[PDB]
Amino acid sequence: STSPGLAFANLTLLLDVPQLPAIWAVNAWRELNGLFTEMKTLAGTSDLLYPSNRYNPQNEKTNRMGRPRKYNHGEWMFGNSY
Amino acid sequence: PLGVKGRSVFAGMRSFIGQRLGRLYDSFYYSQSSTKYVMVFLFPAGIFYTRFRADTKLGYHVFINEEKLYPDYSQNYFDTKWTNGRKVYLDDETTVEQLKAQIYGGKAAPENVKVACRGRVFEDADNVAMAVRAFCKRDPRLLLFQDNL
Amino acid sequence: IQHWNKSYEKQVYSESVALNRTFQARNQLVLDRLKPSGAYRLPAVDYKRQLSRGTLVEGADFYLPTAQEQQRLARHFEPYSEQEQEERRKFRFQSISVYLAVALGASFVHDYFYQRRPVAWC
Amino acid sequence: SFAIPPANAAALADPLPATPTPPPVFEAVSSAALKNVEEVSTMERYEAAVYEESFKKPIVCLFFARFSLQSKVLLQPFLDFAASASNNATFFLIDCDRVPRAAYHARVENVPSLVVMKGDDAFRQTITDSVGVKTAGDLIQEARSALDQVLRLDQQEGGTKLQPGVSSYTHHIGVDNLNVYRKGWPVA
Amino acid sequence: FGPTLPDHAYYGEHATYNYFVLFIRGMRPYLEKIFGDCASTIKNAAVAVYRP
Amino acid sequence: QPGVVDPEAPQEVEAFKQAWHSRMGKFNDRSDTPMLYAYMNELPSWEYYDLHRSAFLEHMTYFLVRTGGDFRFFPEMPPWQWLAHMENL
Amino acid sequence: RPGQGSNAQFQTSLADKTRGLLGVGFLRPTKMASFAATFLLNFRFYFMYMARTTFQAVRPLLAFSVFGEVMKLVLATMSSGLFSFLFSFVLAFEVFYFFLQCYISYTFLTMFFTVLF
Ligand SMILES: CCCCCCCCCCCCCCCCCC(=O)OC[C@H](COP(=O)([O-])OCC(O)COP(=O)([O-])OC[C@@H](COC(=O)CCCCCCCCCCCCCCCCC)OC(=O)CCCCCCCCCCCCCCCCC)OC(=O)CCCCCCCCCCCCCCCCC
Ligand SMILES: CCCCCCCCCCCCCCCCCC(=O)OC[C@H](COP(=O)([O-])OCC(O)COP(=O)([O-])OC[C@@H](COC(=O)CCCCCCCCCCCCCCCCC)OC(=O)CCCCCCCCCCCCCCCCC)OC(=O)CCCCCCCCCCCCCCCCC
Ligand SMILES: CCCCCCCCCCCCCCCCCC(=O)OC[C@H](COP(=O)([O-])OCC(O)COP(=O)([O-])OC[C@@H](COC(=O)CCCCCCCCCCCCCCCCC)OC(=O)CCCCCCCCCCCCCCCCC)OC(=O)CCCCCCCCCCCCCCCCC
Ligand SMILES: CCCCCCCCCCCCCCCCCC(=O)OC[C@H](COP(=O)([O-])OCC[N+](C)(C)C)OC(=O)CCCCCCCCCCCCCCCCC
Ligand SMILES: CCCCCCCCCCCCCCCCCC(=O)OC[C@H](COP(=O)([O-])OCC[N+](C)(C)C)OC(=O)CCCCCCCCCCCCCCCCC
Ligand SMILES: CCCCCCCCCCCCCCCCCC(=O)OC[C@H](COP(=O)([O-])OCC[N+](C)(C)C)OC(=O)CCCCCCCCCCCCCCCCC
Ligand SMILES: CCCCCCCCCCCCO[C@@H]1O[C@H](CO)[C@@H](O[C@H]2O[C@H](CO)[C@@H](O)[C@H](O)[C@H]2O)[C@H](O)[C@H]1O
Ligand SMILES: CCCCCCCCCCCCO[C@@H]1O[C@H](CO)[C@@H](O[C@H]2O[C@H](CO)[C@@H](O)[C@H](O)[C@H]2O)[C@H](O)[C@H]1O
């Protein structure tokens, strides 16, 4: 059964084996988010997307750090400024 | 005699899963109501929520400079006072204004309140995640202070 | 005293009747519908009931799968077939050569494929 | 600490002794083999049945006891049901005190009890009245329904879909530990 | 209101003839087949590589 | 298995049996040093009847009368119908 | 019918059946909360056991290391012959004490790592 010398393993099991479903769920959610990101990239984007990055806020009116783009009021002959 | 002709290993798997599920239902039925519901739904659910929130979202330890800037939590229950060092989980789209409103309970906040991390002031129209990434990488301790100067 | 205690008993029994009615209702509504069939019941009987039946056995923490292995101590003349004897004669000692070879291979793999760490270069 | 004394001469004595029979006057009352069933009196016969005939074609076993009046009431209609459906299944008549290991095997807790078996774990349906509301007719109707169900399932899916379950690896050892001897496992 | 639970709901299983040991002794043949096939495949590959 | 010359001896067999029984008892039995007896709100049949001898008598007389039978067929858990009838009586 | 006489007494009210569906005197959320509290409080035994186990495991290490450091201080400080003659016996006593601590630890560890099943 068990014993005082197995307290380490008992505690570890009781506190960790219930977390394995959540760990697997987190892994699956990460896979799905990656799939959606890749589908969006294939569809097309104005500015690029960093796949393995936490957040990608860049758009036509926003930098890759969440700030407004400088020198973006007018239009440019070569198209997008990026 | 292993296996039978005409039957498939997938059918065997299905039968085994059915047996397991029926046995689980029987064992749950013939059990104490005081323990089974808790141990099977409430601890798993809470553990799942906590682990998912920790491993998916990103949190920040919030502090406030002065006591006069503390919010009014006298009405809401289970928290009748502000404590500095509070862990706050946010979404990647959250801004400084949204954070301030969440802190002050959607009520009138003091004047000229601003957020800083490692001594560096954030703009109110800035994403918290990216601002932290830039100024305090892997040190999300935020401070709310009053910028009169 | 007398009257109050007897009325206490009477109200206790009223509460008992209420509890019994709700018990009947709970059962015949929920439990008679959710009751398992019995096909997936527990495939065992408690050791106390087995002991009362005179059926309990305690021994053989181990087992012998094959009858060839079960009847060895009873045959008395051919515990092992000739082919089995010839096969057994190959394991009179442990193979330190095989031990050494496997240990060297495993150490090589573990050290130069699984336990590589960086080192400075000047 | 828990213990039960081993046994007594009374417990080990013959559970089914003979009793005096009355003359042909007490039988005169207001309410006044079998060629279709098999009376079982040996666990050897019961195991032979359950392990070969139950795999060939289904079996229906009536577990009874002499003290029970429901068993006497149910005997005759069971014999009629046997005469009816003896072509599709086998029919056995077991006494719990004469062959207890057969009752422990079928997991019977009350008498009388019908047990429809096929494969020994593929389809085991037990019919009884643990409350005391049903009657012989209701029990026989439930038995007919169970026999119909098992026959339909056996015909379903080219004879398959009825395979033994836990008995494939348990050998009914948790139910009756004496099967270790049958399996040849040691007991030291 | 009486007992609602059976004895096996509380009492521990047999010590030496338990559910898992019976299950694993029943699965032994399939596991032997599986692992023997895997080991034979690996050994045949290694031998085909080593002999030449 | 022990490293004795004869593990199949009657002494070894009886020692193993006694150890078996003592282990099972120390694990399952209700004692002052309980292992498994814990978090008890709904008791099983055996412990229930061992602690409440009044109910064993009532539940037994009702079984013998409601169903003319032997104590050897005493059910593990009685039906709620029987319990309700007992309460009414 | 056999059981109709008893089943006729089983006639419930609408409120009775609603109360049964809700499980008033059979779910006992107070009992569930008591169980949760007791189960969470029962985690102190693991900490007690691990503390005892670690102490009994490190006892010989302590006897071998810290008393050794003390002996080494004495050796580093002493120069004469009489004190050294007298200190040799202290060293031997430390040997015996180490073996005693090892025996004690062996006993307590075979007690703490003994499982019935
Ligand atoms: C979201 C909300 C979540 C909340 C939950 C919601 C519901 C979800 C389902 C429940 C999930 C929790 C499962 C708990 C079960 C165990 C604990 C318990 O309380 O059980 C008591 C419950 C009642 O038991 P009981 O009342 O005390 O006595 C009755 C016996 O159990 C009756 O026994 P039996 O006679 O009927 O049969 C014997 C039984 C024996 O069960 C037992 O008695 C104990 C089982 C041992 C458990 C721990 C074993 C750990 C072993 C270590 C593994 C080391 C592997 C090393 C490999 C090295 C090789 C490289 O056989 C088994 O079922 C065990 C099989 C698996 C053992 C595998 C071990 C390795 C052997 C491999 C064998 C070959 C594979 C199988 C092939 C089968 C044919 C296809 O047990 C059971 O009902 C059956 C045992 C459980 C079997 C598993 C059932 C499926 C579980 C699925 C888990 C997946 C979760 C992930 C979900 C996805 C999330 C993202
Ligand atoms: C790339 C694909 C994936 C990778 C796969 C790579 C290739 C492997 C494929 C799979 C296996 C081969 C398949 C084809 C086989 C075809 C030929 C054939 O059929 O027969 C085999 C073939 C011929 O068999 P045979 O015809 O019956 O005749 C055999 C001879 O008569 C001789 O019989 P014997 O009775 O005389 O046995 C000789 C034995 C002699 O007996 C002994 O084993 C005594 C010594 C045991 C040492 C302690 C064992 C600890 C085990 C830990 C294992 C895990 C360690 C972690 C792994 C990484 C280690 C760095 O020596 C050994 O061979 C065993 C060596 C064990 C490894 C040594 C590990 C280091 C020990 C360190 C101890 C010192 C500690 C202090 C260090 C400080 C030093 C300053 O010989 C073998 O290959 C033997 C297989 C060796 C397997 C290991 C022994 C079993 C131990 C089990 C340990 C637990 C493992 C758990 C497994 C995973 C969980 C399920
Ligand atoms: C007294 C005893 C006498 C002894 C005599 C000795 C003299 C005899 C000559 C042999 C001398 C021993 C040579 C040992 C290896 C070289 C030394 C060494 O280990 O340096 C470390 C060095 C470590 O690499 P690293 O980049 O610095 O860092 C490693 C980290 O793991 C990197 O970290 P990471 O995170 O990037 O992980 C990447 C990892 C990722 O790995 C993985 O993710 C999984 C690995 C694969 C698992 C299996 C998955 C299944 C898919 C693969 C299927 C393979 C089976 C085929 C299946 C066919 C069906 C589709 O990638 C790999 O490590 C690839 C490993 C390549 C293994 C495959 C090569 C064949 C293996 C069999 C060779 C047999 C030689 C026997 C020699 C005779 C000894 C008696 O090794 C290498 O650079 C790679 C070795 C490339 C092979 C070179 C082979 C030529 C040299 C040997 C000459 C003889 C060739 C004979 C060929 C026979 C036909 C096969
Ligand atoms: C992948 C890493 C695994 C490494 C660790 C595990 C050990 C490695 C060895 C393989 C593990 C699996 C061994 C299975 C042995 C059982 C064989 C057997 O015959 O069992 C009886 C079953 C039931 O048979 P049956 O009852 O239908 O018919 C035969 C009846 N008898 C036995 C009486 C003759 O047979 C099978 O159908 C095969 C089952 C094994 C195949 C599935 C593997 C199980 C492991 C996965 C568990 C999850 C199941 C759900 C999967 C869903 C997939 C989408
Ligand atoms: C490398 C890792 C190696 C480690 C192995 C890792 C894998 C295996 C780890 C297993 C060890 C942990 C197992 C602990 C299991 C404890 C959980 C448990 O038994 O529950 C407590 C309850 C407690 O019951 P109890 O309270 O009556 O009795 C428990 C014990 N005593 C008597 C001492 C109190 O157990 C059960 O009764 C049910 C268990 C089976 C059900 C399991 C959950 C799934 C349920 C799904 C069915 C849902 C039906 C819903 C229907 C609703 C309407 C009715
Ligand atoms: C359930 C399991 C219970 C487990 C209980 C565990 C408790 C006991 C654990 C104590 C382990 C201590 C051993 C390590 C310390 C010695 C290190 C060493 O070898 O030095 C190198 C020694 C001494 O070398 P040296 O001093 O001559 O010179 C080189 C030393 N170095 C390398 C360190 C610089 O190597 C030897 O040559 C020793 C050979 C003689 C044999 C010595 C062993 C006996 C002394 C230790 C006994 C301890 C166990 C007592 C158990 C009593 C139980 C009743
Ligand atoms: C039966 C199969 C079950 C397999 C497991 C499947 C996963 C189940 C849980 C999915 C949770 C979905 O719910 C969703 O979770 C993610 C992650 O917390 C949240 O999303 C959060 O993280 C992601 C990543 O930055 C962003 O959307 C955003 O930063 C934030 O909102 C959503 O606000 C919430 O709506
Ligand atoms: C003679 C042929 C015998 C056949 C043997 C084939 C075995 C091949 C298995 C190789 C698996 C190695 O797996 C790999 O191990 C190395 C350590 O060395 C790890 O290496 C890791 O740590 C090192 C050191 O910090 C860094 O280079 C880096 O962070 C990362 O590569 C990898 O994270 C792991 O993926």
Side-chain angles (χ1 to χ4, degrees):
Chain A
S1 295
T2 143
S3 58
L6 300 170
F8 304 92
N10 292 332
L11 194 71
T12 305
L13 293 164
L14 293 174
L15 297 182
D16 295 1
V17 308
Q19 300 184 1
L20 298 181
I23 291 161
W24 304 338
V26 168
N27 299 124
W29 174 252
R30 290 173 178 161
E31 277 222 43
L32 295 174
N33 291 25
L35 181 69
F36 300 158
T37 304
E38 190 61 24
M39 286 171 58
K40 176 157 54 174
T41 298
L42 292 167
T45 42
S46 186
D47 198 2
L48 54 81
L49 296 179
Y50 297 116
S52 299
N53 288 36
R54 181 73 192 193
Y55 189 51
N56 282 284
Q58 52 266 16
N59 69 70
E60 293 75 1
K61 296 288 170 188
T62 306
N63 268 342
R64 301 175 185 177
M65 304 301 295
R67 296 284 194 83
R69 294 186 183 275
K70 292 185 77 66
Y71 316 136
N72 197 36
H73 179 277
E75 204 66 9
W76 194 30
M77 54 185 295
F78 291 103
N80 290 331
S81 311
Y82 43 81
Chain B
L2 308 184
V4 63
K5 191 168 66 178
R7 192 158 192 256
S8 190
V9 305
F10 313 114
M13 287 196 299
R14 180 181 181 182
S15 69
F16 179 74
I17 296 298
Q19 295 168 9
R20 294 302 106 210
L21 297 176
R23 180 73 201 107
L24 287 174
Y25 178 71
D26 187 307
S27 186
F28 181 84
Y29 184 91
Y30 294 114
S31 298
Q32 293 199 83
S33 295
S34 311
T35 70
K36 69 194 186 187
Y37 295 108
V38 170
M39 185 64 66
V40 174
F41 295 106
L42 307 188
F43 289 165
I47 294 163
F48 191 105
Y49 179 76
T50 300
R51 184 79 187 197
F52 198 82
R53 183 184 61 179
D55 301 352
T56 296
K57 299 183 104 186
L58 63 188
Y60 310 85
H61 291 283
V62 177
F63 307 76
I64 292 171
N65 192 276
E66 292 169 345
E67 198 279 281
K68 85 197 192 71
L69 295 168
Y70 290 5
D72 183 67
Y73 290 170
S74 301
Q75 293 296 322
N76 65 327
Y77 287 103
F78 267 101
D79 50 353
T80 176
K81 190 76 197 313
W82 171 267
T83 43
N84 279 343
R86 258 185 182 184
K87 187 74 169 292
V88 174
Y89 289 93
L90 304 174
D91 305 70
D92 300 354
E93 304 80 67
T94 307
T95 60
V96 173
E97 297 290 57
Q98 302 176 24
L99 169 63
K100 218 180 289 176
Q102 178 174 341
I103 290 296
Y104 288 99
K107 313 208 300 184
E111 305 78 357
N112 306 318
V113 170
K114 291 189 168 55
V115 187
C117 199
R118 188 149 285 264
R120 301 160 197 200
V121 189
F122 299 176
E123 289 186 331
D124 304 330
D126 274 6
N127 183 265
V128 173
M130 312 311 294
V132 170
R133 191 187 198 268
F135 296 121
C136 54
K137 190 72 155 58
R138 298 173 62 85
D139 189 70
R141 294 173 299 197
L142 308 184
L143 182 77
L144 276 63
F145 68 101
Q146 208 180 23
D147 190 337
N148 310 284
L149 214 57
Chain C
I1 305 180
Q2 302 174 354
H3 305 61
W4 286 38
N5 294 34
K6 299 165 78 67
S7 299
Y8 293 160
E9 293 211 68
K10 180 53 54 169
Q11 282 92 75
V12 168
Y13 298 9
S14 177
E15 292 186 356
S16 305
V17 167
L19 177 59
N20 182 12
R21 293 177 184 174
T22 182
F23 166 81
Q24 299 170 29
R26 176 176 69 95
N27 265 271
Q28 69 189 299
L29 286 178
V30 193
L31 305 182
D32 292 67
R33 302 187 191 181
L34 270 46
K35 198 175 176 57
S37 51
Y40 309 111
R41 64 192 303 179
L42 196 154
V45 179
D46 59 84
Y47 77 101
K48 297 186 167 179
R49 195 167 289 112
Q50 270 167 351
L51 197 71
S52 70
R53 291 170 169 186
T55 271
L56 187 71
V57 182
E58 304 88 347
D61 270 3
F62 62 101
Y63 81 134
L64 302 158
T66 314
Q68 183 67 8
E69 304 162 359
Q70 298 163 4
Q71 303 301 341
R72 295 203 196 281
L73 267 47
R75 277 182 260 162
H76 273 107
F77 271 91
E78 201 74 333
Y80 301 93
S81 65
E82 301 296 343
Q83 199 278 350
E84 204 162 3
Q85 288 182 9
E86 303 328 71
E87 294 290 359
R88 309 246 305 169
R89 290 184 214 292
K90 300 187 303 203
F91 308 106
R92 298 185 295 208
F93 314 94
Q94 293 163 239
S95 191
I96 198 180
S97 305
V98 170
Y99 180 16
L100 182 69
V102 174
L104 291 173
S107 300
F108 184 83
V109 175
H110 175 73
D111 296 314
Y112 301 99
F113 287 91
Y114 285 94
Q115 288 291 326
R116 307 191 66 89
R117 282 168 180 84
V119 170
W121 195 324
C122 320
Chain D
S1 177
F2 175 84
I4 295 166
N8 290 339
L12 302 180
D14 187 62
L16 307 177
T19 44
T21 181
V25 56
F26 297 85
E27 304 177 3
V29 191
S30 46
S31 50
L34 283 293
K35 287 70 65 176
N36 297 91
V37 309
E38 181 58 88
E39 171 60 19
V40 176
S41 60
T42 317
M43 187 62 183
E44 189 280 343
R45 183 70 175 91
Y46 179 77
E47 293 184 74
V50 165
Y51 296 130
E52 307 171 354
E53 307 176 14
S54 73
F55 286 85
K56 284 175 291 205
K57 66 189 297 183
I59 63 180
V60 187
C61 299
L62 182 71
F63 297 86
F64 73 86
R66 66 183 300 163
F67 62 83
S68 198
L69 169 59
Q70 304 83 351
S71 301
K72 293 183 66 56
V73 171
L74 180 57
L75 181 56
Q76 178 56 27
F78 176 75
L79 296 170
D80 297 83
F81 174 41
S84 255
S86 296
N87 172 272
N88 308 317
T90 316
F91 285 77
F92 293 94
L93 191 65
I94 300 109
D95 188 355
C96 297
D97 297 72
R98 206 182 182 186
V99 188
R101 283 192 66 198
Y104 304 155
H105 177 288
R107 307 299 299 279
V108 315
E109 296 110 16
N110 46 38
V111 294
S113 299
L114 278 303
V115 191
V116 185
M117 280 183 283
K118 181 77 171 60
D120 196 341
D121 259 7
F123 184 96
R124 184 181 300 187
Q125 188 163 339
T126 304
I127 301 95
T128 181
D129 190 2
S130 14
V131 183
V133 292
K134 296 171 183 173
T135 184
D138 302 5
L139 266 52
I140 297 298
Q141 294 163 24
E142 291 176 318
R144 292 180 182 279
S145 70
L147 183 57
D148 283 327
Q149 186 184 348
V150 63
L151 293 168
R152 190 182 65 252
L153 294 175
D154 184 71
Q155 282 106 52
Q156 169 176 313
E157 193 173 336
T160 64
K161 196 256 166 202
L162 283 184
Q163 296 297 329
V166 295
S167 62
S168 314
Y169 58 82
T170 296
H171 310 301
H172 306 286
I173 288 168
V175 175
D176 184 65
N177 300 124
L178 302 180
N179 287 277
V180 302
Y181 297 101
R182 191 186 76 194
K183 297 302 302 187
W185 297 359
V187 291
Chain E
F1 278 100
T4 74
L5 294 173
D7 298 329
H8 69 79
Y10 165 74
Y11 285 108
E13 54 265 31
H14 207 279
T16 166
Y17 305 120
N18 56 70
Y19 313 133
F20 174 83
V21 89
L22 298 175
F23 176 74
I24 205 75
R25 294 175 183 177
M27 295 303 107
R28 178 165 191 168
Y30 310 92
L31 295 167
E32 283 177 343
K33 181 63 160 50
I34 290 165
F35 295 134
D37 290 1
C38 288
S40 302
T41 296
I42 294 167
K43 155 170 163 173
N44 299 335
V47 166
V49 164
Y50 178 76
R51 264 163 48 201
Chain F
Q1 290 290 84
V4 297
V5 64
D6 197 342
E8 295 185 1
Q11 293 80 235
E12 275 54 72
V13 172
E14 182 57 23
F16 185 87
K17 293 183 178 182
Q18 295 301 325
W20 195 95
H21 283 288
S22 62
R23 293 151 48 196
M24 299 298 287
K26 180 171 173 52
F27 180 70
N28 286 287
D29 279 61
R30 162 175 47 79
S31 173
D32 305 329
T33 315
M35 280 187 169
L36 185 70
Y37 196 90
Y39 313 105
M40 277 291 151
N41 310 129
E42 306 184 358
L43 303 169
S45 306
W46 200 95
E47 302 291 358
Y48 182 92
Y49 291 136
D50 185 12
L51 298 176
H52 311 285
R53 308 303 188 85
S54 168
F56 172 75
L57 191 68
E58 302 163 6
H59 296 186
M60 170 53 93
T61 59
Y62 194 93
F63 164 73
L64 299 170
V65 182
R66 173 59 175 281
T67 72
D70 297 329
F71 67 102
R72 294 174 294 117
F73 293 79
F74 184 61
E76 196 162 65
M77 50 175 291
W80 61 273
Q81 302 87 337
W82 297 13
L83 291 167
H85 199 200
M86 288 187 228
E87 293 298 341
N88 298 337
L89 301 168
Chain G
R1 285 282 180 273
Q4 63 185 5
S6 174
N7 289 18
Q9 291 179 351
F10 304 153
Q11 307 294 8
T12 60
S13 170
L14 197 155
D16 283 327
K17 57 182 71 187
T18 314
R19 206 165 57 193
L21 191 154
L22 296 180
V24 165
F26 310 98
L27 301 178
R28 307 214 275 272
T30 184
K31 294 286 183 181
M32 305 213 302
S34 173
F35 151 76
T38 311
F39 178 82
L40 297 173
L41 269 298
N42 291 130
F43 270 67
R44 62 190 184 279
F45 294 102
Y46 304 112
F47 296 102
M48 297 172 181
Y49 295 153
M50 64 173 55
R52 284 157 54 76
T53 302
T54 57
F55 172 54
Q56 294 298 338
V58 304
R59 173 192 297 269
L61 185 67
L62 302 190
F64 203 78
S65 294
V66 311
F67 303 159
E69 275 284 38
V70 175
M71 298 291 123
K72 288 181 175 201
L73 280 170
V74 179
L75 292 173
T77 59
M78 81 189 189
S79 298
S80 65
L82 184 59
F83 185 89
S84 310
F85 183 84
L86 299 171
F87 186 67
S88 57
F89 307 112
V90 176
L91 294 169
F93 174 91
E94 289 294 344
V95 176
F96 282 97
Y97 189 80
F98 167 78
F99 278 114
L100 187 73
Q101 298 292 300
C102 285
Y103 169 78
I104 290 164
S105 73
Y106 171 87
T107 296
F108 277 104
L109 289 176
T110 185
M111 280 166 58
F112 299 165
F113 286 93
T114 291
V115 302
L116 304 179
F117 309 85

